[PDB]
Structure 1
């Protein structure tokens, strides 16, 4: 009902679609990284639904500032090092660089370049409604 708080909600509703169009690519990259890391680090697992949870959990939490290098690649007194355990930090670095630099800035540009028409349409529709 507010003169200023209606068009903002309409803009949010109109921008959710553009956000969803990038969520899919982000999910693809995240799932690839998670599957690679889980497969490399745990080679003696049995089929269980716990496997389907470790794919998305930590890779999703890591792109919101919750990075812990002591758990992406545990040091390896210590139990013997897994075969090819050094690829995990490299793929983690590549995944972070792709997720937090390229796609986020591209989405920012997409939001920035498509603001004027959305604002005008939202104002017109609010005045009509």
Structure 2
């Protein structure tokens, strides 16, 4: 959880400077991903925006940094495999291992 959350927060958003949302993104969402929902809907550029906040005026997550042309800068070909691997490692193998040890 710690590894994936730190990496994902690092390669998407820049200089949050707010402990609340830092711990909300690093820990809470990956933990929630263990039972059901995919860890993040932000890894894909197809659906995004309208929930962003430039600066920290409002109570919403910090936005993904843009480029000279005002497009998302992060590449998907490293984010998507990362989340796939994390979900496969956590949701499936670990629970089944726990079941076996309990038995």
TM-score range, shorter chain: 0.5 to 0.7
- In the other structure, the counterpart of 1:42 is 13
Superposition misfits of 4+ residues, deviation over 6 angstroms: none
Cα deviation code 1:33-73 (max 9, x no counterpart)? 11111111102x2422021221011111112111276x131
Contact 2:44 2:76 in 1 (8 A): no
- In the other structure, the counterpart of 2:29 is 58
**TM-score, length basis structure 2:** 0.65
CA RMSD in angstroms, aligned pairs only = 2.2
Uncovered stretches (5+) of structure 2, i.e. residues with no partner = 50-69
- In the other structure, the counterpart of 2:87 is 96
**TM-score, length basis structure 1:** 0.53
1:1-129 pair list within 5 angstroms: 30-43=1-14, 45-49=15-19, 50-67=21-38, 71-75=41-45, 79-112=70-103
Q: Which has the higher contact order (CA 8 A, sep 6+)?
A: 1
Uncovered stretches (5+) of structure 1, i.e. residues with no partner = 1-29, 113-129
Identify the structure with the greater helix proportion.
1
Q: CA deviation at 1:102?
A: 1.4
Larger Rg: 1
